[PDB]
Amino acid sequence: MVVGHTPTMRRVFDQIRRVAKWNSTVLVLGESGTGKELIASAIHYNSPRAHRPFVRLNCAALPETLLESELFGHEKGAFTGAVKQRKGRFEQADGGTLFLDEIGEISPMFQAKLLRVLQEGEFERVGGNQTVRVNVRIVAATNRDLESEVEKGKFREDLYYRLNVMAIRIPPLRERTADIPELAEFLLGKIGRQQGRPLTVTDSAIRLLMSHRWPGNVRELENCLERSAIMSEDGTITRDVVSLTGVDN
Amino acid sequence: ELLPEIFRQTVEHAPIAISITDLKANILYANRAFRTITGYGSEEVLGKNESILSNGTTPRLVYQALWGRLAQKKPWSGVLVNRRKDKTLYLAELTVAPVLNEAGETIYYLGMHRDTSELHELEQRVNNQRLMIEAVVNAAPAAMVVLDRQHRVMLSNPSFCRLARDLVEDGSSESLVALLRENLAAPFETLENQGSAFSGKEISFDLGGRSPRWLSCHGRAIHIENEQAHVFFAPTEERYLLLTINDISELRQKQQDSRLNALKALMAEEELLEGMRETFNAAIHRLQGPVNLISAAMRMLERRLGDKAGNDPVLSAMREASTAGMEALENLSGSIPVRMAESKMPVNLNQLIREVITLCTDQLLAQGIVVDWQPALRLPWVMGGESSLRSMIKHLVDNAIESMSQNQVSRRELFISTRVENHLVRMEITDSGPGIPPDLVLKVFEPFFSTKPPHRVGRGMGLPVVQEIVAKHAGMVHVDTDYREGCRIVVELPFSA
C-alpha cells in the first residue's frame, strides 16, 4: 500500500510495522504530505491495535485548555463550552493507537504533565485525582522545529526529549527521487484501474518529478494526478493537463 | 414268436461289443462290433476267457459282485474299464445275465458292454474345473467370493475367511458376504439383474477406534449352462455373481498425510518469517527510543550554548551516544528482509482448518479437549499465500489450548468456527479456559509480554505474529470480550469473491 525503496525508506517503512507491534509512543517527524497520518494508519493496521480504535489528533488545531482536557478528560463545567463530561483520549483509546498530529504545538505547562504519563502510563483527569495505570499507545507527530522552541523556552525540554523518543523522520521526496517512479505507479495504477481508463502521465511531467524539491511531497503529487486525469479525455495526463491542477513548478 | 435266426442277427448287427460265454467266461460267440470295439478277430474270439479284458484297476468287489449275482441267477449291473486288443482302455458298462434253458438251468453267460469313456472324461474335467475355482479362489489377496442367484457362498478363500475373521466375529465367509451386500448396493444389484461386471467401486467402513478400511470392490457375472440330459439340444444359462474386494485402506488415508505434512511444513516457515521479522522488530524499537532522545540532546545543548557548544564535552557525549544508535538504526533497518511475493494461489480455508486440526488433534486429546469442527459448507477460497494464512491458525489455537490445562476449565473444549461476516472470513477460535484478564487482553498482544512466564515457550510473540499475518492481509484480529468462559479470538480477513 505504501511504496519506497531508498535507504531512507528502509528505516521509515521498517519502523512502521516495528513500532506497530509495541505500545511505545511514536513521534512521526516530517513536513506536509510526507504520510504522517498514513504512516500511523499503516502502523495501526499492522499493530495488534488494528482491531481497536485508532485516534488521530492535531495538537495545533485545539486550544491549550481544550488540548489538556481532550487527552486526560475533564469534569463537567471545567471550562467554557464543556457542556457535558467527556472521556479523555488516553482512556477512550485505552488499548488503542493515538495519533497526535503536530504534537509540538503544545504549551510548556502541559508538556510537564504529558511527560509523567509517558513514563509510568499513569495520568490524572483535568480536575480528577484518581491515578489510572493504562496500557495506552501513543503516536505523536510534528513538522514544527521543536528545537527552536526549546531553544526559545516555549517548549519544555524534558518532554521534548520524551516526545522525540520514537522519531521516525519521513524523508522529503527530494532525497528519495529514485522512489518517485515507484511511488507514482501505485497511485497512477490505482486511479487508472479505479476510473476504468488508463490514466497515464507524459514523460515531460516525469522529468518535473525528478527535479522537484517536493515541499508537499506526495500530497501535492496526488492532488495533481487525480485532477489531471479528469480533464484528460482519454486519461492520458499530459503536462498541460498536469498544469491545470495548479501545481507550481 | 419270431424266428430264432432273427435273435441271432439281432446280436450280430449291433454296434456294441456283445459276447456269449460259457460258465468259465470263455467267449463262445461274438458279434461284429465286439470284434470292432474289442479289436479281436472273429477266429481270435472263440475260446478266450473274458478275464483278459480285466486290467486290474477294477475293484475286485465289482467282479465278485458280478460273478456272485450270476450264481444267484440274477443280472448284475455296473461300470468297468475294458482293454481293447491294442491295449487301449475305455470305460465299459458291463452287465452279465444268466441264460436259462427250458428247465430253468443256467447254460451260458452273456457279456455286453458299452463305451462310457466320455462320461468319465467329463466328470473329471468337471472335477478338474471344480478344482480350478477352488484353487484360483485361494490365490486372490483381494477378498473374492462367488455368489449364486440366492447369494450362497459356493467357494471362498482363506483371505475372505481372514477378512471374515477380521471383519466378522464368527469368521465365516457366509457372514462376511451379508454385510458386503448392503454396502455395495447399486453395483451388486446391477450385476445381479443384468450381469454387468462392475470394477473399482470404493466403499468405506468406520468401525470405531481403528483407521477406517477402504476397499476396492469389483465384480462380474459367472454363467452356468443347463446340464440335464433333456436339454442337450437347447442348453440354458444361469448366473452367479463374483465379488472381488481389494484392500486400499492405507492408500487413500496416506494421501491425507502428505498434504497434511506439506500443510504443516509450508506454514512452519512463516512463523519463523514472522518470528524473524517480529523478533527483530524489537531490536530497533527498543533502540529507536533511547537513541533519538540523545539525537535531540546534541541539537539542544548546541543551540543555547552556540559558539561555546563546540567546546562542551557534554555536547560530544550525547553526539557519540546518538551516532552509535543512529548507525544501528540504519544498519538494523537496511538489512531487514524484504518478503518475496509468495505465490498467491487458491486456498481452501475449510480444507486447511480440517487439516490443521488433524495435526494438532493429538495434543488436544492429550488434555481431553473435545474438538468440534464445523467447516462452512460454502466458503470462498482466498487468493493468497496458502502457507501464510495457514500459519496463523496454529498460533491462536495453541495458546488457547494451554488455557485448557487450567482448572477453570471445568470441561475442556476447543471450538473453531469459520463464517463470512461483514464480507470478511471471520475466524473465531473459542475456548473453555479462564481466558485472559481484561486489563491484559492487549498487553498479551504486546511483543514479549506473556502472562505465563517467558520461562516456557511464551516469547510474547504468538499474538504479535497473528496480527502481522492478519495485517499483511489488511485484516483485523480481536478477542471477543462478551465471552468470559475463556478466550475467544476473532480474525477477520478478506477473501476472493
Next chain:
Amino acid sequence: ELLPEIFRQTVEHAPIAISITDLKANILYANRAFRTITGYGSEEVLGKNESILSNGTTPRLVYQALWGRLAQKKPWSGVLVNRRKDKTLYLAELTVAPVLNEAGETIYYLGMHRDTSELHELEQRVNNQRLMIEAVVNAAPAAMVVLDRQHRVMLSNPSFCRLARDLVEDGSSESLVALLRENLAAPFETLENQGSAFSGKEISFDLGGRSPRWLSCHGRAIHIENEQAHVFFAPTEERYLLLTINDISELRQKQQDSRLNALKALMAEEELLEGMRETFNAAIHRLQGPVNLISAAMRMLERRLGDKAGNDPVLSAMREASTAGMEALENLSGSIPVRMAESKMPVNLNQLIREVITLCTDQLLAQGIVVDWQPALRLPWVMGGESSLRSMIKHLVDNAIESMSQNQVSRRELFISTRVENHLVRMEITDSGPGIPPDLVLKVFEPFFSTKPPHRVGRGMGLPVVQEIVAKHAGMVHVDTDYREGCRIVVELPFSA
C-alpha cells in the same frame, strides 16, 4: 455261432432295451431290460408302435437318416432323447439295423439304445464350470495369469493384457509372463516345485524418470486331476500355477512425500525458536551500546550542574532514557525462549544433509543451481539436540540461495561436503554467489550482520544462529578466508566417540 435258442435268451436277458419290430417299427418282441429301462410291461409293448418312446424333443431331421440308412442295408448310429412309460426323458444312443431273412431280404427292424444321460450332464457341467474360469478372472483388479507346467498362458484378464501392454512392449500376455517370471524368482520357484502358496511378494520396477511401479504378487497352485477314462477309480493330479498381482505403486510414492513434508515442518519450527535466541544477543548487545552511553551522560552532566541537577529538564528525560534503556535491556534478556528440554542425542548429520537437499530441491532447480553433495562415508554421531542440529544445514543453505539469487552471479553452482576433523564433525557449504569479503569473514558471525541488498530476504541471522547453536554444541563455526569464488562456511561440531 451257437445254438439259436441261446440268442433268443441272449436278447431276453440283454441288459439293454432290445425290441424286434416289423417294417413299420411296431414292436413284436420285448426283452426284460426294455421293461426295466423304458418301464413298459411285456404285454403292453407287443403290438405298440415305437413312437410311444418318441417325445418330439429330438430333431426330426435325424429320423430321416435313421429310416434312410436302413434302406441301403447300412447301420445307423445316433443319440435320441427317448421317452419312458413314466414320461421321464434320458439320452438314448439308438442304433437301428435291418433283420435279413436267409435270402438276404429285410424282414424285421431292430430297436436298440443305451442310456447316455450321465455323459451329457457332465460335459455341460464341463462347459458350465469352464465358464466359471473365463468370467471370474475378467473383473478382478489384480493382474492374474493361469500357467501350465510349461508356463504357457492358460488364462488372462483384460488387466493382465493391459498389464502386458503396460509392462511389455508387445502387449501379449505370454511375454508379460516372461517379464513377471524373472522377477518373482523364489516364491514362484517354491510355488512351482512344491505347490506352496506365496502371498505378498512385493517387487519394485523403476521406469526411469517416473515413479517406480511396485507390484504386490501372490501365487497359489492349481490342481487338475487326470480325465482319461482309465483312471475312473484312481484319478491322478497335476499342478498348474496362478499368479495374482496387485498394484501398490502409488502408495509408496506418496509415502516418501509425507516424511519429506513432515520433516520440512520440523526444520522450520526449529529455526524459529533458535532464531529467537540469537536475535536476543544482537538486541541486547545492540541496545547495550547506546543505552550505556545514555547512562554515562547523566552522571557527567550531574556533576557540573550540582544543585541544579534536580530541576534540569535535560537531565530528567535522559535520566529516564537510561531507565527506559535499563528496562529495555531487561525486557530483552528475561524473555529468551527457554527451549523445552532438547534431548541431547547422537545425531548423524549425513542423514540430515540428504534430507535438506531433498527438502530444498525445489528452489535449487528453479535457479539452475547444480547441487554437489559429498556425504562422509563414516560420520560419527553428533551429540546434541536433533532438533537443533537439523536446523543447522538449512541456515547455511539459506545463506547461499539468497546471495545466489543476486543477479551479479552469472554462473550458479552450489557445493556441499562433509568430513571429520580434529575429533569434530566439520561441514562446509560452498556456492558461486557474491561471497563474503575477506574483511567480513569473521564479523558476519556477530549477530544480525548482513551485506545482502535489501531487495532479497536477508535476515543477517543464519550464521549467527549457526554460531548460536554451534555454541550450544560446544563447537566452532567460521567462514573460510581462503575461498574467494563464493562463500564457504565451516561448521565444527564434536561427535560422540
